[PDB]
């Protein structure tokens, strides 16, 4: 019979597996004089739910246009209302049916008009710099061709079609096509044209590709010059002059510069060149570098390197794939800022404007092909397209572009197949063709383990005990003894690790130890350095960022997008902070004696000429002694060992026994660079005089006694629960043990290994960690000094239904001053529930105070803060902070906050001060209870009731990185024990 | 030092290990004619949130009262606004510690004022029939003692005490206390003195406890009686009474009856009688029954009996444990009335009213001490009172309280230890004690499976297949052969079984037919019968039923305690009106050619006299014939073959062809009983006359192609989706493939046994189940006949990251009156997700029509719901309801309404009716989506949103019982297979 469907020739081209048809070959993006209009402004637009309601209504011509409106371009159009932004991490938003595309398929009606001068004939062309996913091209009603490779640039041939005067350029975009399957990065789903889209003039003689070769011979000092030139696809007659270096070579002739200064992530020289033939002229920024694999070690000119990483996609929480080029400079610039060389473009080509910034600033670059097929794993990798056949153009396509694009930076040291796309044919069609076009850089896929078709071993989120052994080179062997050999000789890169989830990441200066040991290890890169909130605005005034769920998806996989080392308006995270000194290229280990600091310099190429070296002594009142010291660079790799002035030893020697000093050596930019001002610091190093033990209060207060309350001193008890009532006039409203943190994302997930699996957070609720309940088994007052006494309130805490428990005993002493609050908890039953040992959050004390706290101020370790496996950024020193800023703004409230290793704290609470002293506490102060905090999605659900909630620490446990990759290391794991622990209080008028 | 704490006195009582002190020896409740005077009322109360802070402000003498205000006697303190009801399952409530209570344990101090006469002089007592948990009692003042075991009477000598004229009784009610521990029944946590307080006079010669034995020869028709009657302790002078049988006779004297008429459930003669003393004389009805096991099997009378039973706890939901008496009485004649004979008092003494009403109406009681420690077992049972000697004195006071009191009647056929209190030396010790007190009743305990210290097997929930292993007596041994060997003699109970949570119970069927089958099966009683739901109001005037968590518990078990045939006003679920129909007494197995029917009298005892049979022959007009037929009284456990009158099989025999008739025969009560009135149904069968297959139109209509939209007939399609947008001018908003249902209770339970124990629910979530999409793959016009065609539509319904799907064809044909809709189903991939199968919970479609439907008619089974393992009590007939009464109030919502077996419906939609026909299909309608029932906790969010949702099924899978107990037997299962069915519609004015 006769079909009667609608839309069948627009669906048959979506679900079509071949790259897109009717453009120009793909080759660099460059620099040239060749007139140029960029198209980017106001388009109009009109969306349609899906290819069968699409209207064919001639909209390409730009007349009478029904239901269109204003729409910026570039854009990701469900940023500006049009539909909903969707996330998913693995799976897939569509059934799994590959060509096939979903009904529900947005369908972007984009048109231009714009005016075409006499210098765009007789040849121009359109560049389209990234559309999502599928696009089809009009000028003028004509049909240039369609897109595919969403992160892709297209050029289409406009000879004869491109008109003198008023031109109309339609492009009708599908959200979903068969690309899609093969797009399935774990961030935003975003439909748009939403990179540049340009029209430029093809003059005559002109050059339409060049490809840069600059090596360095590292033994002589002289750079390897071939800069060839093409123009439809043959090697042309041109000029390139390279003023710098007193040069004159006619492209295509490889040439000996007898001396050049080489190109790193350090060092990021740049030689000013030009190729011109009659026609055009490009501009070109040449860095020389040579890249091997030597000795299972990557090598830059002819040195082993650090990779200090990390994974940067590309996000905006107002504008979405569009990332505006003042905010491209400035996060580049902060992760200069905090020590970064290292990016890996995550997990598609970067805009085309990225790369010149990468040269410029110093980064080494992985520069991976806009391909992912994770989604096909949960079915055993069935009908994957990395293996399909069908597929081989697309994805030979998809590599092509991606290597002609970028192929002449300096910057991009490794060409990356993708991300998370099996194993499969496809992936070894792509890495052939790679290696024969550019066999200067090595190649890079974590998805195929065994390395068949790649340069390095590249792992994500292996544990620092395989990364330890595979350091050592004896990782197991492959089944295959000759894929094993290859893959021993190869040097290890981790492509993500140290998840920046939430509270974290844990466990970076491990890895770190072993990156610095072992030379087959080439580094890791963090995953990830920005979080992918979305700005959701409410009808009041506030912002919060939104994440997956939050705009209607059916599916969607929750706040797995904010997983950042930055916010999305890139504020750090206490991670970053971290970060930068985990990977701090100078090491600095101040001598307990301050006489001095051993100094090493960790960079791979750079002395420390740059840096000014600063010290300073700080006590309670502030700098006692500073100064600037004077250090002959030493040179990357050696170390060296610095003496400070005598004055700053003399000063030591001097302070009285337990007062609290502090030194301090920075290195900091001695001169502004490109990346940050002088005296911006790079690496520091701390010795710290200790502050003396409290001296606990004499017990010379008597317990007065009356019918419903206690007194002791400037404490009053409930005589029915033997819990101060308040202390020096400061309402307590409760005290108690804590056990229990409101679990950070890595909480959240699974434990893997052995017979449980269930999330940290799981097994605390199971346990009944959470909902602690404590019996008051009896107050006895005993015989202090000199008539005093002291008062010891024996409890029990335990929870509903279990039978462990642990007994808590709280001694209070008091001179009416000071205030001597001894605790002890030991341990009662077994500490097992569900079949598996309970780990605790923590041991400590929770006060709940009936008045809100403005101020804290601690000496300790800080300003932001510090777990047990994090806070390596954290220094000592004194720090004050207002309350609000004591707090962390993950987008999903979670634990945060806790300042480990302090030594004394003081809340200011409106007129009067409380002040916390004793051996090493954390504190954490909150306006809000840790159960509002755990129920708490967004930070709009955080309220304050009125109260200051403190948490004083005598253990925490560490944070781990178990949302991905390991979970907290055995060292920094809290198993049920006994404890005990003194504090002393005393408020203050 | 000193000890300063505050209630130490009060929580060394609360913690005590003993039964309550200085209480009078536990005996019978008994009618006598002794001076009573109920103190039930308005009495004073006050509420304190724990021991430490309760006043001891002398109030017990009723004097210048602080802060005391009215609440009704008896009562459950938290059903009147003094704090809230709790709900646990197995989790206590607080830290399991014994013998240790909670801090925070509410203390109700009440305080009555009354009048003591004359009669009341010079002796009397104050009896209280259940104090939940811990009672203190003063008279005057003066200390009488405590009172422990909950659910248990205590009498106090008030000699001496008592003062003539005003009296002022006072209790001090703690709700946790060590006896908390043994009292974990699954059910709310109520505190009260929530049972009758009686002043009762104690005349000089008088009667304080009385015996009955009351045995029945059943070879010789003799009874055989004994009544002891005892005072202070020791046998007494006393005269026994039975004017019906010409009996005088001295108590404590054993006498042969030569006849008297024996007690059953079926047949409760009662006679009678009274002993007498010169100071007082006690009213009791006798009811001559005898026990015995013999050839492992339970016999009552000489003859095995089949047990009926249900589960029956006490709740009211308004009043909490308090159960007024007319509700007592009604559910009992609601029990009767659905054909059950048995009740096991769970978990404990019910109120002591129970017992006459029992004997009166006919019930086998399992008669159980209140002892439930549940939850020890998560901690493998360690501090178990059940096995603690420190805890004998208290057990074993539990089971004497229990069975001196009830001990006289006739319904109590088993005295039970408790429920779910593990294993151990107390249980030994209580049952020991019982053997010796009382050797005429086997006692029951299912929580020891070795049944060392039971006279019955009792098991809890096992499954259909175990149940039959042990019917045939092939059960595993015991390690132990003595106790293996006993065991195997003994006959076996469920005491437990076919858990009546929510939609359900499936599978009661298979276990009946084990029970009529194997006569070492004694029966098993339902859970249960009550769902425990409490009364909520709303501000605006609705009520519905809360759950646990609904009243702000800390740790609850939801909606578990909702659970029973019944709701908790008494109102039966669809699962009693299947029970009836599956335990009922007689079998009516009706001829085909409707000539008779065959008879079967499954009673033990009784023949068919009190039942008249009749006969009715109904078709799609009404009734055709009708009558009632004489029958020869038949034996319990014989049959015969009644003939229907010729007139019937001559109406049958005359039908045309595919014309529907059913006969129904039915068993009803000829007179009045005294649980329900004359024309009761007790038992029924049928003879079905199907209608023939509808003929499908002629396909005679062409397709009407437009841009937009196809028209065949009265169907108009979407041309862009090819489903129908109105039919007949009812407009179709939506049509497509289900393959899932808003889970049941059952299918949020736990799948137990292989490496999958997802629940289903989380097996059809985890599938995308619940988020079907369809693509569109064709749609054709065919030729029909005499140039109409047919409209095939094909498409594919999948789920997002899914890779299987199902193909579904739709061909659509009209003869422009009546439409033909043929849809096929073939399984497209193999349908595992997780590792594990894909179950389907349906084969069906849902129409979703853009108008609101007020009448649901069909011909097929009702009028109530059916699923593929229930549905028994729902008949074949023509039924016809308003929308609302198609659903069901569980009182969380879920799938339910289901009418299976429907071969024709109608839908009245306004003016118009949406008519269906068809080879057999399950037919839901509903005024809100499968999505808003799945997200409903309570019955408020459900909201009509003006559409109908109805939903044809070709197929459904069973409901089972997985919330507790057996899943969907294997043969109700729903495996993804290929379909094809077809259905008629028209729409008429
Ligand atoms: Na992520
Ligand atoms: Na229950």
Redesign the pocket.
Same mark, same amino acid.
């Given at each position: 019979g006769r079909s009667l469907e609608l839309g069948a020739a627009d669906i048959q081209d979506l679900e079509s597996f071949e790259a897109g048809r009717g453009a120009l070959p793909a080759r660099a993006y460059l620099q040239s004089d060749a007139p140029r209009l960029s198209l980017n402004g106001e388009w109009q637009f009109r969306l349609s739910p899906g290819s069968r309601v699409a209207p064919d209504d001639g909209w390409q011509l730009g007349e009478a246009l029904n239901g269109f409106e204003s729409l910026p371009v570039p854009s990701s159009w469900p940023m500006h209302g049009h539909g909903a932004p969707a996330y998913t991490?693995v799976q897939f938003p569509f059934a799994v049916e590959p060509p096939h595309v979903p009904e529900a398929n947005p369908i972007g009606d984009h048109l231009v008009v714009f005016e075409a001068g006499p210098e765009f004939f007789p040849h121009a062309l359109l560049r389209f710099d990234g559309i999502e996913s599928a696009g089809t091209v009009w000028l003028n009603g004509v049909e240039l061709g369609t897109t595919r490779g969403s992160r892709l640039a297209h050029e289409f041939d406009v000879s004869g079609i491109l008109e003198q005067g008023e031109n109309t350029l339609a492009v009708r975009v599908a959200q979903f096509s068969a690309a899609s399957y093969v797009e399935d990065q +774990?961030m935003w789903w975003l439909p748009g044209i939403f990179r540049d889209v340009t029209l430029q003039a093809r003059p005559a003689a002109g050059i339409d590709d060049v490809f840069v070769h600059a090596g360095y011979d590292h033994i002589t000092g002289e750079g390897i010059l071939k800069v060839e030139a093409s123009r439809g696809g043959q090697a042309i007659d041109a000029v390139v002059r390279v003023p710098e270096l007193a040069l004159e070579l006619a492209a295509g002739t490889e040439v000996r510069v007898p001396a050049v200064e080489p190109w790193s992530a350090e060092v990021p020289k740049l030689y000013e060149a030009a190729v011109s033939a009659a026609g055009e002229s490009v501009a070109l920024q040449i860095g020389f570098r040579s890249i091997a694999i030597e000795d299972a070690q990557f090598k830059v000119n002819g040195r082993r390197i650090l990779l200090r990483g990390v994974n940067r996609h590309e996000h905006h929480p107002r504008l979405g794939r569009v990332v505006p080029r003042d905010v491209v400079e400035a996060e580049l610039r902060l992760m200069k800022q905090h020590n970064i060389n290292a990016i890996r473009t995550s997990h598609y080509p970067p805009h085309p404007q990225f790369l010149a910034l990468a040269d410029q600033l110093g980064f080494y670059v992985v520069l991976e092909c806009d391909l992912e097929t994770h989604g096909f794993e949960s079915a055993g990798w069935a009908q994957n397209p990395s293996d399909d056949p069908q597929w081989e153009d697309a994805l030979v396509d998809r590599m092509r572009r991606t290597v002609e694009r970028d192929k002449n930076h300096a910057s991009v040291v490794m060409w990356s197949l993708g991300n998370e796309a099996g194993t499969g044919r496809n992936l070894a069609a792509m890495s052939r063709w790679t290696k024969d076009r550019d066999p200067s850089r090595p190649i890079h896929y974590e998805g195929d383990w065994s390395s068949e078709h790649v340069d390095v071993y590249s792992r994500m989120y292996a544990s620092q005990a395989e990364t330890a052994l595979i350091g050592q080179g004896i990782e197991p062997a492959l089944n295959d003894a000759a894929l094993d050999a290859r893959r021993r000789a190869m040097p290890f890169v981790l492509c993500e690790y140290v998840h920046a989830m939430g509270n974290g990441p844990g466990g970076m200066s491990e890895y770190q130890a072993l990156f610095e040991k072992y030379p087959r290890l080439m580094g890791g890169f963090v995953w990830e350095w920005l979080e992918h909130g979305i700005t959701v605005s409410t009808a009041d005034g506030v912002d919060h960022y939104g994440y997956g769920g939050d705009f209607g998806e059916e599916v969607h996989d929750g706040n797995?997008?904010t +997983?950042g080392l930055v916010d999305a308006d890139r504020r750090p995270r206490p991670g970053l902070l971290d970060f930068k000194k985990v990977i701090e290229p100078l090491r600095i280990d101040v001598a307990r004696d301050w006489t001095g600091f051993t100094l090493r310099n960790g960079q791979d190429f750079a002395d420390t000429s740059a840096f000014s070296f600063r010290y300073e002594v700080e006590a309670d009142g502030g700098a006692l002694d500073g100064g600037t010291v004077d250090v002959a660079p030493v040179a990357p790799q050696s170390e060296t060992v610095v003496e400070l002035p005598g004055s700053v030893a003399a000063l030591a020697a001097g302070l009285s026994d337990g007062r609290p000093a502090v030194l301090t050596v920075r290195a900091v930019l001695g001169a502004d660079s490109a990346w940050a001002d002088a005296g911006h610091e790079v690496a520091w190093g701390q010795s710290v005089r200790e502050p003396g033990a409290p001296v606990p209060p004499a017990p010379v207060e008597p317990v007065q006694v009356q019918d419903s309350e206690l007194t002791l001193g400037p404490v009053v008890f409930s005589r029915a629960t033997g819990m101060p009532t308040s202390i020096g006039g400061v309402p307590v409203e409760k005290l108690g043990l804590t056990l229990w943190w409101a679990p950070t994302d890595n909480d959240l997930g699974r434990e893997w290994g052995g017979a449980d699996e269930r999330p940290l957070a799981t097994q605390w609720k199971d346990a009944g960690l959470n909902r602690l309940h404590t019996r008051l088994l009896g107050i006895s007052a005993n015989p202090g000094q000199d008539g005093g006494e002291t008062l010891t309130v024996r409890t029990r805490v335990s929870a509903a239904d279990k039978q462990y428990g642990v007994l808590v005993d709280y001694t209070w002493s008091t001179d009416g001053e000071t205030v001597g609050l001894r605790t002890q908890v030991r341990r009662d039953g077994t500490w097992v529930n569900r079949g598996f040992e309970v780990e605790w959050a923590r041991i400590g004390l929770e006060f709940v105070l009936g008045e809100e706290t403005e101020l804290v101020s601690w000496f300790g370790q800080g300003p932001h803060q510090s777990y047990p496996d994090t806070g390596q950024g954290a220094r000592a020193g004194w720090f004050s902070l207002p309350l609000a800023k004591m707090d962390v703004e993950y987008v999903r409230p979670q634990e945060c906050g806790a300042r480990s290793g302090s030594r004394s704290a003081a809340l200011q609470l409106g007129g009067r001060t409380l002040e916390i002293c004793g051996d090493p506490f954390a504190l954490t102060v909150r306006p809000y209870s840790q159960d509002v905090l755990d129920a708490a999605a967004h930070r709009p659900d955080l309220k304050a009731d009125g109260r200051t909630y403190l948490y004083v620490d005598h253990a925490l446990r560490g944070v781990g990185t178990a949302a991905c990759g390991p979970g907290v290391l055995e060292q920094y794991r809290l198993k049920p024990r006994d404890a005990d622990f003194i504090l002393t209080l005393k408020v203050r008028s």
């Amino acid at each position: 019979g006769r079909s009667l469907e609608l839309g069948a020739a627009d669906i048959q081209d979506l679900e079509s597996f071949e790259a897109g048809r009717g453009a120009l070959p793909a080759r660099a993006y460059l620099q040239s004089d060749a007139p140029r209009l960029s198209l980017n402004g106001e388009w109009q637009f009109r969306l349609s739910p899906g290819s069968r309601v699409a209207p064919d209504d001639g909209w390409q011509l730009g007349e009478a246009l029904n239901g269109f409106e204003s729409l910026p371009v570039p854009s990701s159009w469900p940023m500006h209302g049009h539909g909903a932004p969707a996330y998913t991490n693995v799976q897939f938003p569509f059934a799994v049916e590959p060509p096939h595309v979903p009904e529900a398929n947005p369908i972007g009606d984009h048109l231009v008009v714009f005016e075409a001068g006499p210098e765009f004939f007789p040849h121009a062309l359109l560049r389209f710099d990234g559309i999502e996913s599928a696009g089809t091209v009009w000028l003028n009603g004509v049909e240039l061709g369609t897109t595919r490779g969403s992160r892709l640039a297209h050029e289409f041939d406009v000879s004869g079609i491109l008109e003198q005067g008023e031109n109309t350029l339609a492009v009708r975009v599908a959200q979903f096509s068969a690309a899609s399957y093969v797009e399935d990065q +774990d961030m935003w789903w975003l439909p748009g044209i939403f990179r540049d889209v340009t029209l430029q003039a093809r003059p005559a003689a002109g050059i339409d590709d060049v490809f840069v070769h600059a090596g360095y011979d590292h033994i002589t000092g002289e750079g390897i010059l071939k800069v060839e030139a093409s123009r439809g696809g043959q090697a042309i007659d041109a000029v390139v002059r390279v003023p710098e270096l007193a040069l004159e070579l006619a492209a295509g002739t490889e040439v000996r510069v007898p001396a050049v200064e080489p190109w790193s992530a350090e060092v990021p020289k740049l030689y000013e060149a030009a190729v011109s033939a009659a026609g055009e002229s490009v501009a070109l920024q040449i860095g020389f570098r040579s890249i091997a694999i030597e000795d299972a070690q990557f090598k830059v000119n002819g040195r082993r390197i650090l990779l200090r990483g990390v994974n940067r996609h590309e996000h905006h929480p107002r504008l979405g794939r569009v990332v505006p080029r003042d905010v491209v400079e400035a996060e580049l610039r902060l992760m200069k800022q905090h020590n970064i060389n290292a990016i890996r473009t995550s997990h598609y080509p970067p805009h085309p404007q990225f790369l010149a910034l990468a040269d410029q600033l110093g980064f080494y670059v992985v520069l991976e092909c806009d391909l992912e097929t994770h989604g096909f794993e949960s079915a055993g990798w069935a009908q994957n397209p990395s293996d399909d056949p069908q597929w081989e153009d697309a994805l030979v396509d998809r590599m092509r572009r991606t290597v002609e694009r970028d192929k002449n930076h300096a910057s991009v040291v490794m060409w990356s197949l993708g991300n998370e796309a099996g194993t499969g044919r496809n992936l070894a069609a792509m890495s052939r063709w790679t290696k024969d076009r550019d066999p200067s850089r090595p190649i890079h896929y974590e998805g195929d383990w065994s390395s068949e078709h790649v340069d390095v071993y590249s792992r994500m989120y292996a544990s620092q005990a395989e990364t330890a052994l595979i350091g050592q080179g004896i990782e197991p062997a492959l089944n295959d003894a000759a894929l094993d050999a290859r893959r021993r000789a190869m040097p290890f890169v981790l492509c993500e690790y140290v998840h920046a989830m939430g509270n974290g990441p844990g466990g970076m200066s491990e890895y770190q130890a072993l990156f610095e040991k072992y030379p087959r290890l080439m580094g890791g890169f963090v995953w990830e350095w920005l979080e992918h909130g979305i700005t959701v605005s409410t009808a009041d005034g506030v912002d919060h960022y939104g994440y997956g769920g939050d705009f209607g998806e059916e599916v969607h996989d929750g706040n797995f997008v904010t +997983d950042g080392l930055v916010d999305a308006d890139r504020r750090p995270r206490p991670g970053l902070l971290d970060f930068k000194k985990v990977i701090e290229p100078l090491r600095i280990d101040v001598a307990r004696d301050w006489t001095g600091f051993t100094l090493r310099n960790g960079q791979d190429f750079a002395d420390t000429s740059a840096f000014s070296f600063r010290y300073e002594v700080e006590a309670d009142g502030g700098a006692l002694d500073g100064g600037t010291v004077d250090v002959a660079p030493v040179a990357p790799q050696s170390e060296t060992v610095v003496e400070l002035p005598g004055s700053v030893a003399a000063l030591a020697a001097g302070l009285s026994d337990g007062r609290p000093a502090v030194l301090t050596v920075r290195a900091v930019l001695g001169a502004d660079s490109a990346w940050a001002d002088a005296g911006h610091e790079v690496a520091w190093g701390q010795s710290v005089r200790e502050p003396g033990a409290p001296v606990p209060p004499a017990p010379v207060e008597p317990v007065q006694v009356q019918d419903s309350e206690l007194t002791l001193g400037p404490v009053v008890f409930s005589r029915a629960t033997g819990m101060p009532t308040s202390i020096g006039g400061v309402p307590v409203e409760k005290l108690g043990l804590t056990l229990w943190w409101a679990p950070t994302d890595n909480d959240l997930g699974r434990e893997w290994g052995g017979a449980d699996e269930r999330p940290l957070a799981t097994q605390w609720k199971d346990a009944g960690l959470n909902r602690l309940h404590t019996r008051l088994l009896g107050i006895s007052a005993n015989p202090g000094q000199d008539g005093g006494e002291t008062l010891t309130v024996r409890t029990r805490v335990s929870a509903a239904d279990k039978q462990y428990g642990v007994l808590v005993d709280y001694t209070w002493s008091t001179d009416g001053e000071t205030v001597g609050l001894r605790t002890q908890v030991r341990r009662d039953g077994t500490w097992v529930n569900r079949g598996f040992e309970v780990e605790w959050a923590r041991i400590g004390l929770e006060f709940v105070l009936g008045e809100e706290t403005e101020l804290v101020s601690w000496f300790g370790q800080g300003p932001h803060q510090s777990y047990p496996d994090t806070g390596q950024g954290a220094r000592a020193g004194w720090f004050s902070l207002p309350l609000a800023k004591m707090d962390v703004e993950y987008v999903r409230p979670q634990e945060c906050g806790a300042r480990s290793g302090s030594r004394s704290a003081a809340l200011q609470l409106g007129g009067r001060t409380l002040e916390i002293c004793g051996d090493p506490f954390a504190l954490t102060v909150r306006p809000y209870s840790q159960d509002v905090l755990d129920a708490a999605a967004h930070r709009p659900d955080l309220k304050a009731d009125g109260r200051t909630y403190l948490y004083v620490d005598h253990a925490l446990r560490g944070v781990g990185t178990a949302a991905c990759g390991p979970g907290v290391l055995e060292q920094y794991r809290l198993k049920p024990r006994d404890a005990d622990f003194i504090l002393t209080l005393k408020v203050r008028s």
